[PDB]
Coordinates of C-alpha atoms in Angstrom, one line a residue:
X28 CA -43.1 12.3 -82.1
X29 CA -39.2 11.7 -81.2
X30 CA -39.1 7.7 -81.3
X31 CA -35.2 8.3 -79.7
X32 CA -36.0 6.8 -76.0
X33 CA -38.6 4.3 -77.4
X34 CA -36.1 2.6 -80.2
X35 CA -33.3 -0.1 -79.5
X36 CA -30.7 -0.9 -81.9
X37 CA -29.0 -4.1 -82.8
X38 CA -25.3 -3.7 -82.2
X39 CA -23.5 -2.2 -85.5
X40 CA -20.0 -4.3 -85.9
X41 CA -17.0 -1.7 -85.6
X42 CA -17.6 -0.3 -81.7
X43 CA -15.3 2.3 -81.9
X44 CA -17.1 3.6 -84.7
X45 CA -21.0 2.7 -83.3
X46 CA -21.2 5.9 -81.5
X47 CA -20.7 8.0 -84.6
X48 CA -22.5 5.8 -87.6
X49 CA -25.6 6.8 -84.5
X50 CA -25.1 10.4 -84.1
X51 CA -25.2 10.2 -88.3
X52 CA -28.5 9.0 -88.9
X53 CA -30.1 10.8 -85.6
X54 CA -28.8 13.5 -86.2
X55 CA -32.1 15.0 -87.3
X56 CA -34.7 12.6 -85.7
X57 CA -32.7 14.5 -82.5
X58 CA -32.5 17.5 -83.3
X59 CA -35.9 18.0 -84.8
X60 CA -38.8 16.4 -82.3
X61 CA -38.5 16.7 -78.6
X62 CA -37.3 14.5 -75.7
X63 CA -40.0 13.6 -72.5
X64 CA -38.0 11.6 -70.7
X65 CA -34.9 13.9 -70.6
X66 CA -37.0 16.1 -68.3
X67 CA -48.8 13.4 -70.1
X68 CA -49.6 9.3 -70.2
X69 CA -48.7 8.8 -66.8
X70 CA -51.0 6.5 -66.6
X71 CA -49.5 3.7 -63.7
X72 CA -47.1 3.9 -61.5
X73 CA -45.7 0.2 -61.8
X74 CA -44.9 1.1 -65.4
X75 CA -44.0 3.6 -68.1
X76 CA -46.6 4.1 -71.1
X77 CA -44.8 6.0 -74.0
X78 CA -45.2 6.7 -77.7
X79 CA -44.4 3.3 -79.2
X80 CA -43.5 2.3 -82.6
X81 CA -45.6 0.4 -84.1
X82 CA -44.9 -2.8 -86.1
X83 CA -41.0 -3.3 -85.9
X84 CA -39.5 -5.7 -83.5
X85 CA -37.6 -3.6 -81.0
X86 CA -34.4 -6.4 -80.8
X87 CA -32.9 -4.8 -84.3
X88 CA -33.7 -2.6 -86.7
X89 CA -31.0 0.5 -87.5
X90 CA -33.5 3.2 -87.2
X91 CA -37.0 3.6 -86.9
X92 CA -39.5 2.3 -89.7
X93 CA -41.1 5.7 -89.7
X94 CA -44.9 5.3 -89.5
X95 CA -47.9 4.3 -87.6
X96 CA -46.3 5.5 -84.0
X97 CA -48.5 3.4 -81.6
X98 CA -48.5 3.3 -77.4
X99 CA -46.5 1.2 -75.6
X100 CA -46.2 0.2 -72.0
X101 CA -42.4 -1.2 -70.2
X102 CA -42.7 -2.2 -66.8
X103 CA -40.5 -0.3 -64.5
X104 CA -38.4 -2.3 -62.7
X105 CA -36.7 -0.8 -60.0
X106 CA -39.0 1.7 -57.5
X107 CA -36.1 4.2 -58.3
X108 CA -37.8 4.2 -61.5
X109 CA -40.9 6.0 -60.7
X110 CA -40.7 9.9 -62.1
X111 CA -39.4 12.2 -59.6
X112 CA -42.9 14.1 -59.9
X113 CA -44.1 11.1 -58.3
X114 CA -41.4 10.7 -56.0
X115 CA -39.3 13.6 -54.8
X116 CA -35.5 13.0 -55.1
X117 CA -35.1 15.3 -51.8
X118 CA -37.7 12.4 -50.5
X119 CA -35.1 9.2 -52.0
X120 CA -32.0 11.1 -50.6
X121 CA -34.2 11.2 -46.8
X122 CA -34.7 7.4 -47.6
X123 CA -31.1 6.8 -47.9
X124 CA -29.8 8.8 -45.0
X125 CA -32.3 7.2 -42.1
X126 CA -31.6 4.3 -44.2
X127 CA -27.5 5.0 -43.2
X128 CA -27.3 5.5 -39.9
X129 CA -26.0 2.5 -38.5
X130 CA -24.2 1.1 -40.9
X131 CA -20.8 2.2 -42.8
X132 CA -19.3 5.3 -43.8
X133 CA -16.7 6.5 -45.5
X134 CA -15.0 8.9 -43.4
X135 CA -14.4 12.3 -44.5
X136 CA -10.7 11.6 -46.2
X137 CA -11.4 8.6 -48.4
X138 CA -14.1 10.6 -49.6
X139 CA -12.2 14.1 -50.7
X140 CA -9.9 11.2 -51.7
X141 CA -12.2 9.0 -54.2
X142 CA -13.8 12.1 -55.3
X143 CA -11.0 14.4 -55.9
X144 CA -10.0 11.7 -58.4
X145 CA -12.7 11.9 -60.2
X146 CA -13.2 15.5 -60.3
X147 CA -9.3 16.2 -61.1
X148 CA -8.8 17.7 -64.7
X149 CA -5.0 16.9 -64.1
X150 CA -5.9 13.3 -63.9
X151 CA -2.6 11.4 -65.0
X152 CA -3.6 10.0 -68.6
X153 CA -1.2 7.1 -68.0
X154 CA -3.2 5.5 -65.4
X155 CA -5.9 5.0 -68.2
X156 CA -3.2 3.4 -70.7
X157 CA -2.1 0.9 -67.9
X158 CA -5.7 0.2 -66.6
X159 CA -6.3 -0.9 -70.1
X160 CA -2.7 -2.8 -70.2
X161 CA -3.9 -4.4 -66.8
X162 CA -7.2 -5.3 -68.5
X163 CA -9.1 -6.8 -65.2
X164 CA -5.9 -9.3 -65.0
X165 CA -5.0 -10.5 -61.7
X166 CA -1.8 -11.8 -63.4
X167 CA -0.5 -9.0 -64.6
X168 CA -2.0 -6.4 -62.0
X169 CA 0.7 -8.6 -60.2
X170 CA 3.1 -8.1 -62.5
X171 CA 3.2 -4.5 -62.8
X172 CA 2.8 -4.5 -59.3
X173 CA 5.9 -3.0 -58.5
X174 CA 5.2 -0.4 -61.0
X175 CA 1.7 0.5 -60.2
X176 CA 2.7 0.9 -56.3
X177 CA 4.8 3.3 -57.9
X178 CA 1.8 6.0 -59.1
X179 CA -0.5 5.3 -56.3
X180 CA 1.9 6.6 -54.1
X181 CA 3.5 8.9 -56.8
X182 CA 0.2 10.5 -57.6
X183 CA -1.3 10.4 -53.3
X184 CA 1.9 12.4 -52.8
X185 CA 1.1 14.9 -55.8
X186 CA -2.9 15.2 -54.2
X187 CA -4.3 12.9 -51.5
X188 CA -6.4 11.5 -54.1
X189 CA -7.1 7.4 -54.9
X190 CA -4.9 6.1 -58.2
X191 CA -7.4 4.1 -59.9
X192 CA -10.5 4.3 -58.7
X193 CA -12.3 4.4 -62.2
X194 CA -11.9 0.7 -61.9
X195 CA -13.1 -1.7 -59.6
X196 CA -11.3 -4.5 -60.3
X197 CA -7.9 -2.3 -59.7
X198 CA -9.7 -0.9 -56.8
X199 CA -10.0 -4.8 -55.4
X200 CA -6.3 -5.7 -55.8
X201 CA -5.0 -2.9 -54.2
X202 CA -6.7 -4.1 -51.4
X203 CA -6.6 -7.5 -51.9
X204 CA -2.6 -6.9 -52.1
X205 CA -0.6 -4.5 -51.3
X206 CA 0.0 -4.4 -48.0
X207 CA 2.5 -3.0 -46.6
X208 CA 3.3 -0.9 -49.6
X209 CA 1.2 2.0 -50.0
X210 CA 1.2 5.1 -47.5
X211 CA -0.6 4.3 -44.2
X212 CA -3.2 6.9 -44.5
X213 CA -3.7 6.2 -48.3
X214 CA -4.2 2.5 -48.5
X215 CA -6.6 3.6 -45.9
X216 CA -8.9 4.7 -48.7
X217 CA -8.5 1.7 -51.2
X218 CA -9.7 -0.5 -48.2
X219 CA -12.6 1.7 -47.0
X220 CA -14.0 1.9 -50.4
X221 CA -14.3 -1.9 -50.4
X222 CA -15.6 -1.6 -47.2
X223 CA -18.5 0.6 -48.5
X224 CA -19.6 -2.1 -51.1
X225 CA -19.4 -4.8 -48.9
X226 CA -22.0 -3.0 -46.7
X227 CA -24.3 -1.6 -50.0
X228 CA -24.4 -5.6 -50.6
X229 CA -25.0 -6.6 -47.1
X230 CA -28.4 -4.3 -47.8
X231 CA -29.9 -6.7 -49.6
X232 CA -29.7 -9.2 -47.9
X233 CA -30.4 -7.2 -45.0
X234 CA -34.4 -6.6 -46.4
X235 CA -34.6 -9.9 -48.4
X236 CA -36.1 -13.1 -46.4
X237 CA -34.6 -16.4 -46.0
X238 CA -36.8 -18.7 -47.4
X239 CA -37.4 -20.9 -50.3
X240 CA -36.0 -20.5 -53.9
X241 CA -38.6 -19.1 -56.7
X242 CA -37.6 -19.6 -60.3
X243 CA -34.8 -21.3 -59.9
X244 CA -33.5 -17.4 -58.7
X245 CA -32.7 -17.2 -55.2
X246 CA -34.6 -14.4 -52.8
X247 CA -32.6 -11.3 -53.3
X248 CA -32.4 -12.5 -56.8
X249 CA -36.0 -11.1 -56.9
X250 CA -36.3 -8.6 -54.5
X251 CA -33.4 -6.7 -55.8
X252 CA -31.6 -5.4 -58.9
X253 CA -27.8 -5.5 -58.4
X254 CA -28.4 -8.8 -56.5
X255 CA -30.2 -9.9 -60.2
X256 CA -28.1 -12.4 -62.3
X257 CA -30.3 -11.1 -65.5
X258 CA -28.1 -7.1 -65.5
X259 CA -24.5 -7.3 -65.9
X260 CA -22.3 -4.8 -65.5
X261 CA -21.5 -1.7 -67.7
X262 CA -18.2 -2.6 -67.8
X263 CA -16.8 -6.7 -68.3
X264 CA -13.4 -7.2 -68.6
X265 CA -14.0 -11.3 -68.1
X266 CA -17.0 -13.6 -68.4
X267 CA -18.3 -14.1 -65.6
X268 CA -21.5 -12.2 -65.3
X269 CA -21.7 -13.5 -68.9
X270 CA -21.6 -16.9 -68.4
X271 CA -24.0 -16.8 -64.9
X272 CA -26.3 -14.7 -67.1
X273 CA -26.7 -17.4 -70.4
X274 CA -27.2 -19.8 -67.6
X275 CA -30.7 -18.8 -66.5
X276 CA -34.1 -20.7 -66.9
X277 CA -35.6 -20.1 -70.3
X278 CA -38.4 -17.8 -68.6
X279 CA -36.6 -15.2 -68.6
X280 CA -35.7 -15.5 -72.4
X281 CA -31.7 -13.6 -72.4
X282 CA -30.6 -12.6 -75.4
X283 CA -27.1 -11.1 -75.4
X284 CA -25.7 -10.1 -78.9
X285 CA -21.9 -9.2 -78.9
X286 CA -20.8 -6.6 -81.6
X287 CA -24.0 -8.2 -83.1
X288 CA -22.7 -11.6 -83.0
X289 CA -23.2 -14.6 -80.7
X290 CA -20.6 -14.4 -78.0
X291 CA -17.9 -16.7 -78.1
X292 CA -15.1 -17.3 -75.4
X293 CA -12.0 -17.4 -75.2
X294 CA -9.6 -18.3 -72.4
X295 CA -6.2 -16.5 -73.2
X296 CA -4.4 -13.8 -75.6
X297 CA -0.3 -13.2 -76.9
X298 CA 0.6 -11.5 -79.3
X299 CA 0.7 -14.3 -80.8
X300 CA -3.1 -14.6 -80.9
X301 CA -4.1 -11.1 -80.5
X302 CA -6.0 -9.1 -83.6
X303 CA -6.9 -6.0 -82.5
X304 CA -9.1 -5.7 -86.1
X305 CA -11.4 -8.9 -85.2
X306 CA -15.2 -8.6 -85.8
X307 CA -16.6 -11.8 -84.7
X308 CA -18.3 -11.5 -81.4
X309 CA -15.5 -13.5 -79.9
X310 CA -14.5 -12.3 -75.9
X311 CA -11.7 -12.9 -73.8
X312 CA -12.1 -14.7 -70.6
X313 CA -8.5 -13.8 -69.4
X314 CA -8.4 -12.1 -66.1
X315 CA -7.3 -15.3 -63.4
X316 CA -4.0 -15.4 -61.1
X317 CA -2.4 -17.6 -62.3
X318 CA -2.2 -18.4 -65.9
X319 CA -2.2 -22.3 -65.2
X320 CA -6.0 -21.4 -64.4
X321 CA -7.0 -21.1 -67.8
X322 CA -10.8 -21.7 -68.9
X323 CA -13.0 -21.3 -71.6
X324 CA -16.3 -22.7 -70.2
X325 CA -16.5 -22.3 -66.4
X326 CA -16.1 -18.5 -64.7
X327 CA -13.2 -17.8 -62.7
X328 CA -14.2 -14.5 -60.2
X329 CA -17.3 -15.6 -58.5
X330 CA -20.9 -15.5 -58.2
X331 CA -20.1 -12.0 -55.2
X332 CA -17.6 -10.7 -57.3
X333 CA -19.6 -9.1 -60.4
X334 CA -22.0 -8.4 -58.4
X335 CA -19.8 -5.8 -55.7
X336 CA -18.8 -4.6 -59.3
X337 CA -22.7 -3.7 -60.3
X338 CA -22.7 -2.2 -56.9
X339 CA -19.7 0.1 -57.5
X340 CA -20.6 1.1 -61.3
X341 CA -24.2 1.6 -60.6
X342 CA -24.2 3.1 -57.0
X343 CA -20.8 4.1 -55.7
X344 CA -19.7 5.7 -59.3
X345 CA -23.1 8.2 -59.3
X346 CA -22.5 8.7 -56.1
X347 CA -19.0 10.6 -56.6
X348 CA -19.2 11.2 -60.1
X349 CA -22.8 12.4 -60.1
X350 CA -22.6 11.9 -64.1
X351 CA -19.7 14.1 -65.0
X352 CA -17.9 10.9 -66.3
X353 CA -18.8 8.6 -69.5
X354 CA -17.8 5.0 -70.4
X355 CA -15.1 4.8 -73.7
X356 CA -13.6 1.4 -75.2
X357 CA -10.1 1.3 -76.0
X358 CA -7.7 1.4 -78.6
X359 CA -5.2 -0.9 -77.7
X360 CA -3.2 -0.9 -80.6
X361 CA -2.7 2.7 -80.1
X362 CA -2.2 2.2 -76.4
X363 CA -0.2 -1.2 -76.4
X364 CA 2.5 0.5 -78.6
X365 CA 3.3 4.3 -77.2
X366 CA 3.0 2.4 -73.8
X367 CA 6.0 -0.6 -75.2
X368 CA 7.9 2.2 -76.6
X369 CA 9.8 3.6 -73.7
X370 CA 13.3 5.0 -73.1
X371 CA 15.4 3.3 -70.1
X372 CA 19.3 4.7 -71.1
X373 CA 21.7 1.9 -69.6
X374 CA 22.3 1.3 -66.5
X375 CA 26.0 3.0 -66.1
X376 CA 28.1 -0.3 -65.0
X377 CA 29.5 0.2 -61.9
X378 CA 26.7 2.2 -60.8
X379 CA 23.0 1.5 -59.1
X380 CA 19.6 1.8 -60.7
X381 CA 19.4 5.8 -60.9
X382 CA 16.9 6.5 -57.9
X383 CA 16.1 10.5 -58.2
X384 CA 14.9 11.6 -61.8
X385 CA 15.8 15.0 -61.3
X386 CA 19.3 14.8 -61.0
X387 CA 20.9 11.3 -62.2
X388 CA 21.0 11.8 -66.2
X389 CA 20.4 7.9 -66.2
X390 CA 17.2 7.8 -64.7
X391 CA 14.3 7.3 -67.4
X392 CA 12.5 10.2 -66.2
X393 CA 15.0 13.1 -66.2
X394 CA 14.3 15.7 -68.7
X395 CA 17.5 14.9 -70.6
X396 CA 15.3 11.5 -71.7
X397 CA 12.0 12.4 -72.0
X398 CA 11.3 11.9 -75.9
X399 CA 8.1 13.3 -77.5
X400 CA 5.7 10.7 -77.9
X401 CA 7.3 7.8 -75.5
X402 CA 5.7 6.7 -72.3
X403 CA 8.5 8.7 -70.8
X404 CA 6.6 11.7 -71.6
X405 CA 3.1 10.8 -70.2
X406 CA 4.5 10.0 -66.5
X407 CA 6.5 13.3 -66.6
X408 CA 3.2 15.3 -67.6
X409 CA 1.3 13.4 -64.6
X410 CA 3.7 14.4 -62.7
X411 CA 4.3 10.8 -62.0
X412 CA 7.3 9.1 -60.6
X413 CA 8.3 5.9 -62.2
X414 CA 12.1 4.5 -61.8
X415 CA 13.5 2.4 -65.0
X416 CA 13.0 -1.7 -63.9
X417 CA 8.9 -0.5 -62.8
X418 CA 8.7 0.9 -66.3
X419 CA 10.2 -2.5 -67.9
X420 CA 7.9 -4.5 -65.8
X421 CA 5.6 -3.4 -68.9
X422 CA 7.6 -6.6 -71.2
X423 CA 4.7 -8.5 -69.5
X424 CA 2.8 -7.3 -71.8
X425 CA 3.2 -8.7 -74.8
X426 CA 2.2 -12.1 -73.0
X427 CA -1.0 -11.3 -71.2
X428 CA -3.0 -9.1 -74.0
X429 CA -6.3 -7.9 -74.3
X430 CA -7.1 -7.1 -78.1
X431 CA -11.2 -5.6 -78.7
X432 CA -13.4 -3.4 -76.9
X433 CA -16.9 -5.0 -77.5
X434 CA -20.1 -3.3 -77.4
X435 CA -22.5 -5.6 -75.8
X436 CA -26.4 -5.3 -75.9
X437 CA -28.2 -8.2 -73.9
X438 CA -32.0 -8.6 -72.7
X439 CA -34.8 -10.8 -71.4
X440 CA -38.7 -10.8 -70.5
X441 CA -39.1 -9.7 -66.7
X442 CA -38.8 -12.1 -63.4
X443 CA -41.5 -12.6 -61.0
X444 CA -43.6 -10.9 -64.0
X445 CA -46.1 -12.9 -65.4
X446 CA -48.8 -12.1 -63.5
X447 CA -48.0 -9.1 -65.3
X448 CA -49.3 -10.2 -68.5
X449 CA -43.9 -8.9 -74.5
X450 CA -42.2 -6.0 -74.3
X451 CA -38.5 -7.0 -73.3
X452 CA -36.0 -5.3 -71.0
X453 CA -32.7 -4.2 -73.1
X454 CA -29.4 -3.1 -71.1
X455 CA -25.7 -2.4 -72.4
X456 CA -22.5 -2.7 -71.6
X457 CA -18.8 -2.5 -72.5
X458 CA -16.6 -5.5 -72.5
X459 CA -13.4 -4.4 -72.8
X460 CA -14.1 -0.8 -71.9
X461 CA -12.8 1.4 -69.1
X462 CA -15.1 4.7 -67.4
X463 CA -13.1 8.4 -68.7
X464 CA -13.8 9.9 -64.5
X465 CA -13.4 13.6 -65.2
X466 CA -13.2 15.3 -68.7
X467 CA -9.7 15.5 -69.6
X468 CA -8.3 19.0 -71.7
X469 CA -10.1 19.2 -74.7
X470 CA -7.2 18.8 -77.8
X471 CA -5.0 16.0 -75.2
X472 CA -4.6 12.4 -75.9
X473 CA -7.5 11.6 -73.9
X474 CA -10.4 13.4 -75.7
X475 CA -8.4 13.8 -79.1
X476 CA -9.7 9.9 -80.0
X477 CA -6.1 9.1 -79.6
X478 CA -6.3 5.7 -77.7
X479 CA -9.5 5.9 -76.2
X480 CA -13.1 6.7 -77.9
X481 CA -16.0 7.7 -76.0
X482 CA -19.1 5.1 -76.5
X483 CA -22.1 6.0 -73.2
X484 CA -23.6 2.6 -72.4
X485 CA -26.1 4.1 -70.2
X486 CA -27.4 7.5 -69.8
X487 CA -26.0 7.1 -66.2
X488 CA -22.8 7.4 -67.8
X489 CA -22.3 10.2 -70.4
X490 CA -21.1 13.4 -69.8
X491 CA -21.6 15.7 -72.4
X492 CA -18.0 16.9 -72.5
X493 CA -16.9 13.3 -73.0
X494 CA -19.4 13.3 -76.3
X495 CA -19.7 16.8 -77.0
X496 CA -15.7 17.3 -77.4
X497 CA -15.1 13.7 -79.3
X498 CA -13.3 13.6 -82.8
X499 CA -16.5 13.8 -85.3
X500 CA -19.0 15.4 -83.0
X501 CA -21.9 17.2 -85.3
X502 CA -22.0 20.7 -84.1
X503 CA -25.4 20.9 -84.9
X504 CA -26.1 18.4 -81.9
X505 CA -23.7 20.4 -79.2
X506 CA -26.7 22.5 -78.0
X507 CA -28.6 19.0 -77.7
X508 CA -26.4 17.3 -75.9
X509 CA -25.7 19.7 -73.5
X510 CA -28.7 18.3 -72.0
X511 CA -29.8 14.7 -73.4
X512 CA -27.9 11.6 -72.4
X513 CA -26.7 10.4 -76.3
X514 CA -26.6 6.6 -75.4
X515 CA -26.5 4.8 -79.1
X516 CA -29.9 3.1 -80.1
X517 CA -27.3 -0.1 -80.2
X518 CA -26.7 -0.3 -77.1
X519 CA -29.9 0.5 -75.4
X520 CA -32.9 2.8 -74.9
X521 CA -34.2 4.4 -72.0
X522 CA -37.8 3.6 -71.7
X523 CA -36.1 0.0 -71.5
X524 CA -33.4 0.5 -69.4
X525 CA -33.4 -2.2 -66.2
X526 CA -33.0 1.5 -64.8
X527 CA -34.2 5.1 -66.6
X528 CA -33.6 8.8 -66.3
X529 CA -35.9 9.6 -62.9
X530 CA -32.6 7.6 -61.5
X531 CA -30.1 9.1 -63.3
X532 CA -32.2 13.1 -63.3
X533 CA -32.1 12.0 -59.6
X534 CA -28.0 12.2 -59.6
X535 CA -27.7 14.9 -61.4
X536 CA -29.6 16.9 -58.5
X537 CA -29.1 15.2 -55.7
X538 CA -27.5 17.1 -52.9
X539 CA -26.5 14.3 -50.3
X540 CA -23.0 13.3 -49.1
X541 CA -22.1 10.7 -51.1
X542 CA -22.5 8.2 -48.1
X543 CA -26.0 9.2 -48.0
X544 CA -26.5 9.5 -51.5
X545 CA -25.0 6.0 -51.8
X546 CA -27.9 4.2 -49.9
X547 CA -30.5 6.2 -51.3
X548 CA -29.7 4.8 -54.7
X549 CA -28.6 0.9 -53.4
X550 CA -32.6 1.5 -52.0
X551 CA -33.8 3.0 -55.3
X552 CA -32.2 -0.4 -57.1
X553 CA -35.1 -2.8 -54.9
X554 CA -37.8 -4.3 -57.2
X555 CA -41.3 -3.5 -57.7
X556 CA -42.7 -6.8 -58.2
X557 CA -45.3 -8.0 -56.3
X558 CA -42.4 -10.5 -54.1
X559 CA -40.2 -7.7 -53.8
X560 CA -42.9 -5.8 -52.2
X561 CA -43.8 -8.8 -50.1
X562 CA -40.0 -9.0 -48.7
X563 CA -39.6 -5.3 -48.6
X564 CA -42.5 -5.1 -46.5
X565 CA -42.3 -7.7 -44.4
X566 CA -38.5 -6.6 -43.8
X567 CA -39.4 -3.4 -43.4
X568 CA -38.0 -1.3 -46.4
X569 CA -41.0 1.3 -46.3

C-alpha cells in the first residue's frame, strides 16, 4: 500500500529546504503504489478508516518503518469531511446558496476585482517582496504607507484588480486606513472583502446557542472549526493564535513543534538582531502599532482577529483561487537586499521631486535609471508607479525586520470527543510565509527559487505549477503531481488533516459564484460532534 496520506512527519530543521529533502526520499514510495484519497473501507461516516502503519508513533519519524501496514481509523472532524460519494459537492454548493440569501454579497466588481488578482499571470512580483518587507506589521504597513498607496492605485489603474489580496492582514489595513486615499470605486473592494468575513463569522454564531461554557471552550468553540482555538492559521506572521492555542486545557493535549523545536518568542527584530540563518524554533512576535507595544508573553491582535484570518485562508482563498495558488516561505535575505538596493538620482536643487517618470530624467523610474537587478527594475516590469521619497520610505526597513520563515506542525486529541473512545489530529502552517496567488512565468524571480520557495502546508493550497516548476523538482514526479496535492509528510498528512481532500476535491469542482461557494464551505467547516449536532440542529443548520 502507499502509506503517503497515512504518515506525518516531524518538522526537518532548514524549511526552505523541507520540501525537497521530502520529494527525495518519496520519490518512489509516490510514484510506485497508489493514492485513495486523491480521488473500499468506508466503513462510518463520522470517520475515516485507512491503511495504517503499524507500530510507529505518527508525531515523528522521517519516513515510514516499512512493515506490518495495519488499519486505522481518524475521526473526521468537519461534516465537509465526509467523501463527496457520500455527499454530493453539487449538494454542499445548494447548502451554501439557500444558505446566502439574506446575508452579504460581494457585488459583482469586488469580485472580478479580488479574483482577477489572483488569476493575473502579470501579477507585479514586487508586491510579494514588500508583503514580505511589511511582514504582518502594523508599524511599518504605516510606514510604507505612502508607498503602498502608491501600487494599489498604480496597479487598480493598470486592471481593476485588488493590490494585495494574498494577504489578510494587508487586506485589513487598507481598510482599517486609508481612507481617503485610494480610488473611490477601488477602496470599495478592500472594504467589501472585510465585509464578507465579517458575515462568514457572524455564521457561526448565527447556528451556535448561547448557553453555558463546556471544556473550558466556549459554544462556537465546539460547534465549529474556524471558531476553534485548537487550528491556527496556514499562515502566522505574529503569535497570537499561537499563544491562545498553548493556552488550552490539557484535554486536548497540543503539541506544536516549530522547525522541530519548542517555540520560543520573541517580541522585536533590527538588523541588529536579525539572523536570517537561525535554526532554533525561535518566532517573532513583531506585528503591533506602535513599537512602544512590545511583548513577548501576552498577544497583541485579538482573540477575532486570527480567527477572520482562518476565515479568509480557509474559505474566502478557495473560494477565488479554487486551488490554483500554493503557500511559499521567504527568503528575506534575498528579498531584504535587491529590495534596499534602489536608485533615486538626486533631487536636481532648485527643482521639485520629479513627478512623471516618463519624461523627467530625475525621476527613479524613467528608463534612463532603471538598473538590472535594482528594485527600480521590478516596479517598471509591474508596470508599477512609484515616485523617489515612496521608494525611500523602504529605510524603515532595516528597523522593523522579519528574519525566518518557520514551518510549523502543531496537534492535539479531539474536543467534545471522548465519548468517542488515540489517534491525534495534525495540521500545518507557515509562520513567516506568504500564499504565491497565480503561478508566475516559469524561469522569473518568482518561480526561479529566487526570493521565494514554494513549501504546500495543506493540500488546500498547492498548485502543481507552484511545485511542479520549483528549482529541484524530480521529473519523474511531474506526471504525479499533476494530480496529487504534495504536502510534506512534515508538515501534515491528509487522513489527519482538521480538514481532507473531499473539501479540497470539492474546490477543485465546484461551480458556484464565489459568494455562494463561500458559504457552502464556512457550512462545510461546522463540527460533527455529537454538541455540534445538538446546536446545529436545534439552530437549524440541516
Amino acid at each position: 500500500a502507499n502509506p503517503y496520506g497515512a504518515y506525518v512527519a516531524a518538522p526537518a530543521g532548514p524549511a526552505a529546504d523541507m520540501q525537497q529533502l521530502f520529494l527525495n526520499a518519496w520519490g518512489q514510495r509516490l510514484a510506485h503504489g497508489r493514492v485513495r484519497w486523491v480521488a473500499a473501507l468506508e466503513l462510518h461516516p463520522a470517520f475515516d478508516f485507512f491503511v495504517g502503519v503499524a507500530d510507529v508513533e505518527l508525531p515523528g519519524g522521517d519516513v515510514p518503518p516499512a512493515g506490518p501496514g495495519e488499519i486505522q481509523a481518524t475521526w473526521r472532524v468537519v461534516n465537509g469531511n465526509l467523501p463527496l460519494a457520500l455527499c454530493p459537492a453539487a449538494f454542499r454548493d445548494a447548502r451554501g446558496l439557500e444558505l446566502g440569501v439574506g446575508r452579504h454579497a460581494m457585488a459583482p466588481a469586488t469580485i472580478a476585482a479580488v479574483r482577477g488578482a489572483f488569476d493575473d499571470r502579470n501579477y507585479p512580483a514586487v508586491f510579494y517582496l514588500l508583503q514580505a518587507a511589511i511582514h504582518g506589521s502594523e508599524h511599518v504597513f504605516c510606514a510604507l504607507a505612502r508607498l503602498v498607496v502608491q501600487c494599489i492605485t498604480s496597479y487598480w489603474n493598470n486592471t481593476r484588480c485588488a493590490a494585495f489580496v494574498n494577504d489578510y492582514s494587508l487586506v485589513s489595513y487598507v481598510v482599517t486606513y486609508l481612507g481617503g486615499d485610494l480610488p473611490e470605486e477601488c477602496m470599495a473592494v478592500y472594504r467589501d472583502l472585510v465585509a464578507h468575513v465579517e458575515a462568514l463569522a457572524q455564521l457561526v454564531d448565527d447556528f451556535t446557542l448561547t448557553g453555558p461554557e463546556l471544556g473550558g471552550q466556549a459554544q462556537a468553540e465546539l460547534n465549529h472549526l474556524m471558531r476553534d482555538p485548537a487550528l491556527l492559521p496556514p499562515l502566522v506572521w505574529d503569535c497570537d493564535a499561537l499563544m491562545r492555542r498553548a493556552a488550552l486545557d490539557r484535554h486536548r493535549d497540543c503539541r506544536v513543534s516549530a522547525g522541530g523545536h519548542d517555540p520560543v518568542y520573541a517580541a522585536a527584530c533590527n538588523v541588529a538582531t536579525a539572523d536570517f540563518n537561525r535554526n532554533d524554533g525561535q518566532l517573532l512576535h513583531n506585528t503591533q502599532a506602535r513599537a512602544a507595544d512590545a511583548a513577548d508573553d501576552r498577544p497583541h491582535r485579538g482573540a477575532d482577529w486570527t480567527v477572520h484570518h482562518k476565515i479568509y485562508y480557509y474559505v474566502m482563498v478557495p473560494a477565488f483561487s479554487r486551488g490554483r495558488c500554493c503557500t511559499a516561505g521567504v527568503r528575506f535575505d534575498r528579498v531584504y537586499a535587491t529590495l534596499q538596493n534602489m536608485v533615486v538620482p538626486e533631487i536636481a536643487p532648485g527643482e521639485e521631486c520629479p513627478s512623471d517618470p516618463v519624461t523627467d530624467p530625475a525621476h527613479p523610474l524613467h528608463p534612463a535609471n532603471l538598473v538590472a537587478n535594482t528594485v527600480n527594475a521590478m516596479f517598471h516590469n509591474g508596470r508599477v508607479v512609484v515616485d523617489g521619497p515612496a521608494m525611500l520610505t523602504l529605510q524603515v526597513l532595516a528597523h522593523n525586520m522579519a528574519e525566518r520563515t518557520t514551518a510549523l506542525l502543531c496537534s492535539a486529541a479531539p474536543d467534545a470527543g471522548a465519548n468517542t473512545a488515540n489517534m491525534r489530529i495534525f495540521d500545518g502552517a507557515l509562520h513567516a510565509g506568504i500564499l504565491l496567488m497565480a503561478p508566475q512565468h516559469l524561469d522569473h524571480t518568482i518561480q526561479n527559487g529566487d526570493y521565494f520557495y514554494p513549501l504546500p502546508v495543506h493540500a488546500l493550497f498547492a498548485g502543481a505549477d507552484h511545485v511542479a516548476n520549483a528549482p529541484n523538482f524530480p521529473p519523474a514526479l511531474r506526471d504525479l503531481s499533476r494530480q496529487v496535492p504534495l504536502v510534506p509528510p512534515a508538515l501534515g498528512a491528509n487522513y489527519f488533516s482538521s480538514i481532507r481532500q473531499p473539501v479540497v476535491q470539492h474546490v477543485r469542482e465546484s461551480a458556484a459564484g464565489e459568494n455562494a461557494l463561500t458559504y457552502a464551505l464556512m457550512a462545510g467547516y461546522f463540527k460533527i460532534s455529537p454538541v455540534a449536532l445538538h446546536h446545529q440542529l436545534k439552530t437549524g443548520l440541516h
